[PDB]
Write a protein that binds this ligand. Structure first.
Ligand SMILES: CCCCCCCCCCCCC/C=C/[C@@H](O)[C@H](CO[C@@H]1O[C@H](COS(=O)(=O)O)[C@H](O)[C@H](OS(=O)(=O)O)[C@H]1O)NC(=O)CCCCCCCCCCC
Ligand SMILES: CCCCCCCCCCCCC/C=C/[C@@H](O)[C@H](CO[C@@H]1O[C@H](COS(=O)(=O)O)[C@H](O)[C@H](OS(=O)(=O)O)[C@H]1O)NC(=O)CCCCCCCCCCC
Lengths: 200, 200
């Protein structure tokens, strides 16, 4: 669903929507990805837990950051839903860049049936800055579990008898509001000065 | 708490107790371990979700396996709480072996302040059999994030001004009923023929 004119993101509908994402991690076809899935669900659960304390006070994602800034003083933004969403957005951003890169025909012509170059760009853009050396190594090792581009798209459809070309068009359509939403979240962190750069 | 004479493990108290374990993963002192924590909590949450449907029907862990065998026929044991507990026990077992190995003075004399040999034995005994080649590599990479033995024990106390010797005695005491409980769980899977050996 698109953004309102005021670009405020409603927390309830947002959480409803993003809870559809973790299951997709089996479109990757390896148990290597199950811990990532659990990790992302954890951020969603935390934001949900905060939201459920006072859906009115926490009606928008902006409100979450505002109220928590006040509630936590010097520990903010490394606290609460503000912290879980700071990490969730980076996961969302990684997915966005990865998909877009694939949709844009970016590839290694030496190895066109893979998705390493797309995941690597996605990692560099969304996460690398916030991760130390050992996590970068674990990411680099994790990539050997990544499905073939073929299989990945196939899985985003299913046995669903549809072309690669069709699947990519649907992904392209999807990316429009997905990207716009994530850009509003990143903009909100920037303007509230809530972004932390610690390397984990 | 010890086992009853009938060795039946009550589900409610078990879940209460094991929910204390995931937080310990920060005793390891690296965000490398956060996905593992989320993974283990996921198994606990799933068992809890099943238990909450009918605490009477699911009063013991044995009951879980029994009722699910019946409910799921040919998909059992790769289903439900039986599957989450099959994986939880392996995590519990890994922790047990790791601790015991440390308590038993097992070490690499070339590198005594580390815990690699203890984690490696723990991995070989609890998990290696169920994991493919890429996960074994990720485990092997993860170990470079492992704390020094010193720091690990220190963290199991805290600033808590207590000796290594003291901490290990408390761990030894802890391991008695911990181990006995886990042995009953493994025995139950064996006798119900509910163990799956698929390599993930
Ligand atoms: C045999 C078993 C061996 C397995 C051993 C380990 C396996 C490797 C696991 C490590 C992999 C690296 C991934 C690291 C992830 C997390 O450290 C980071 C930070 O996570 C946050 O840490 C936080 C603490 O922050 S800190 O105070 O700054 O430390 C919080 O705990 C926060 O929780 S919450 O309560 O706020 O909601 C939590 O998510 N998470 C991320 O990096 C996001 C990962 C998004 C993944 C995007 C998709 C990747 C796809 C990969 C496929 C190629
Ligand atoms: C930048 C971001 C990069 C990060 C990318 C990935 C990082 C690496 C993550 C992979 C690490 C390997 C660990 C793999 C764990 C899991 O695959 C396995 C199986 O997990 C189960 O899979 C299951 C599916 O089973 S299957 O049908 O057979 O596939 C279920 O999904 C089950 O969920 S539940 O719903 O049943 O409750 C789920 O736990 N889990 C384990 O191996 C247990 C791990 C215990 C860890 C013990 C402590 C390790 C400490 C390490 C420190 C040295």
């Amino acid at each position: 669903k698109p953004l309102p004119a005021d670009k405020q993101i409603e927390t309830g509908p947002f959480l409803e929507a993003v809870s559809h994402l973790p299951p997709f991690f089996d479109c990757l076809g390896s148990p290597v990805f199950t811990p990532i899935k659990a990790v992302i669900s954890g951020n969603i659960t935390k934001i949900k837990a905060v939201y459920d304390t006072n859906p009115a006070k926490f009606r928008t994602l902006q409100n979450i950051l505002e109220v928590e800034k006040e509630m936590y003083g010097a520990e903010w933004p490394k606290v609460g839903a503000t912290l879980a969403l700071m990490w969730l957005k980076r996961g969302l951003r990684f997915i966005q860049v990865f998909l877009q890169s694939i949709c844009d025909g970016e590839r290694d012509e030496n190895h066109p049936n893979l998705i390493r170059v797309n995941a690597t760009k996605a990692y560099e853009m969304a996460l690398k800055k916030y991760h130390g050396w050992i996590v970068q190594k674990i990411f680099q090792a994790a990539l050997y579990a990544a499905p073939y581009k073929s299989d990945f798209l196939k899985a985003l459809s299913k046995g669903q008898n549809v072309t690669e070309e069709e699947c990519l068009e649907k992904i392209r359509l999807f990316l429009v509001n997905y990207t716009a939403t994530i850009d509003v979240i990143y903009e909100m962190y920037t303007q509230m000065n809530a972004e932390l750069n610690y390397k984990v």
